Design a binder for this molecule. Structure first.
Ligand SMILES: CC(=O)N[C@H]1[C@H](O[C@H]2[C@@H](O)[C@@H](NC(C)=O)[C@H](O[C@H]3[C@H](O)[C@H]4N=C(N(C)C)O[C@H]4[C@@H]3CO)O[C@@H]2CO)O[C@H](CO)[C@@H](O)[C@H]1O
Length: 392
């Protein structure tokens, strides 16, 4: 099958970022993953923002109208799917912020059963092609086994629904995973793999506020010359998953569409104090705001890493340029990996400067993307417009 092109659409982008599902270059992707869904102690998966998610009326939504109906970004993603039939959508559950509350439901059968059922309920009501868990991170051995069992719960859940609808489609189950060794070495990766459609390796956040020296935050290869500039590397993670037994073609390489900043720095590998501002939070800048005035951009192709640095303000921002995104595409093809994943859809540029554009083209263009037709039929949906495949 060809490569996957996965992006995350984040619940909250419809606010300050102004990004709605309508303005996704859908022909560029195969999988939109909508983040994030939260979990209750019970195991109950629920929607983080029913305004964004389900209720907001976009242009095109009759306010009035017969039926019990869904709107929000869920209707918009379904409309994206009706128009782009190779575009699948997955509900993504967890996130850095909600992962404190995965361990308690995951430890019991009731909790996992409840997780599986509520997740399926949500998928089949809202028109999703599957679900994606993002538990950062199972912190002990027990939590890891729990994660295999939870995965199993969800795989069994989704499959039962497909059994109930044999003329319809099979459904997806993925996870966002750790590129840091201290986290993935706790995971039972190969047992987990049995349940998953693919893995979205978060091959980023390798350097940031937490560190003492400015580093590369999503570099592919270790700097031999300057070890302190590369505390992690994509490559270590990918070949470690592969020695662990994950098929490479199931590993989708995560790439950031934002950059992490460092203040009071001479440059890469030196100490910094502070991280400055950001586009939305401190120390984090949207790639489409790069490059900032007065910074020179350095591209280190051999380890596939780049950064801007302003010599006067002594500020470093680790982020990928098109040349670097191209080197990343290169690694994906060369190593026969599952494709590219991006966090997150609003921070990218367009046209010739789209990082995603750049990767799809180095993948051989859209013609080399995995052709898997999505699911438009949701017979059991609790929403009438969605159940009826959204007419006008
Ligand atoms: C609390 C909440 O749900 N939303 C917050 C929001 O928190 C976000 C951001 O800080 C994200 N960081 C960004 C946009 O750079 C952060 O993203 C994480 C994400 O959880 C990790 N998991 C993935 N996946 C691929 C699933 O990618 C990584 C990235 C790495 O950056 O996620 C949190 C929620 O976990 O912060 C905003 C302000 O930015 C706030 O309004 C509120 O909506």
């Amino acid at each position: 099958g060809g490569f996957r092109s996965v992006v995350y659409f984040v619940n909250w982008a419809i606010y300050g970022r102004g990004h709605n599902p309508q303005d996704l270059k859908a022909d560029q992707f195969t999988h939109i993953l909508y983040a994030f869904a939260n979990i209750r102690p019970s195991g109950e998966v629920y929607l983080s923002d029913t305004w964004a998610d389900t209720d907001k009326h976009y242009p095109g939504d009759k306010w009035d109208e017969p039926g019990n109906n869904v709107y929000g970004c869920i209707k918009q993603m379904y409309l994206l799917k009706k128009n782009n039939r190779n575009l699948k959508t997955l509900l993504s559950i967890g996130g850095w912020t909600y992962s404190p509350n995965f361990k308690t439901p995951a430890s019991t059968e009731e909790g996992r059963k409840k997780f599986a059922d509520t997740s399926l309920k949500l998928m089949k009501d809202l028109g999703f092609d599957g679900i994606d868990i993002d538990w950062e991170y199972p912190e002990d051995e027990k939590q890891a086994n729990d994660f295999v069992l939870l995965l199993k719960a969800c795989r069994e859940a989704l499959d039962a629904y497909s059994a109930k609808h044999p003329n319809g489609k099979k459904f997806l189950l993925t996870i966002a995973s750790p590129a840091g060794p201290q986290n993935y070495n706790k995971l039972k990766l190969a047992e987990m793999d049995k349940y998953l459609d693919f893995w979205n390796l978060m091959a980023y956040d390798f350097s940031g506020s937490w560190d003492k020296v400015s580093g590369h935050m999503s570099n592919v290869f270790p700097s031999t010359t300057k070890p302190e500039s590369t505390p992690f590397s994509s490559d270590k993670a990918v070949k470690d998953y592969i020695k662990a037994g994950v098929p490479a073609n199931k590993i989708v390489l995560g790439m950031p569409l934002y950059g992490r900043a460092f203040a009071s720095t001479d440059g890469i590998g030196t100490s910094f104090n502070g991280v400055g501002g950001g586009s939305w939070e401190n120390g984090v800048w949207d790639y489409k705001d790069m490059p900032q005035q007065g910074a020179q951009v350095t591209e280190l192709e051999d380890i596939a890493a780049s950064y801007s640095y302003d010599k006067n303000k002594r500020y470093l921002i680790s982020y990928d340029t098109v040349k670097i995104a191209g080197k990343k595409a290169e690694y994906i093809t060369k190593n026969g990996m599952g494709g590219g994943m991006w966090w997150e859809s609003s921070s990218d540029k367009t046209g010739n400067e789209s990082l995603v554009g750049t990767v799809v083209n180095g993948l051989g263009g859209t013609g080399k993307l995995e052709q898997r037709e999505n699911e438009l039929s949701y017979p059991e949906s609790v929403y009438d417009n969605l159940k009826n495949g959204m007419p006008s």
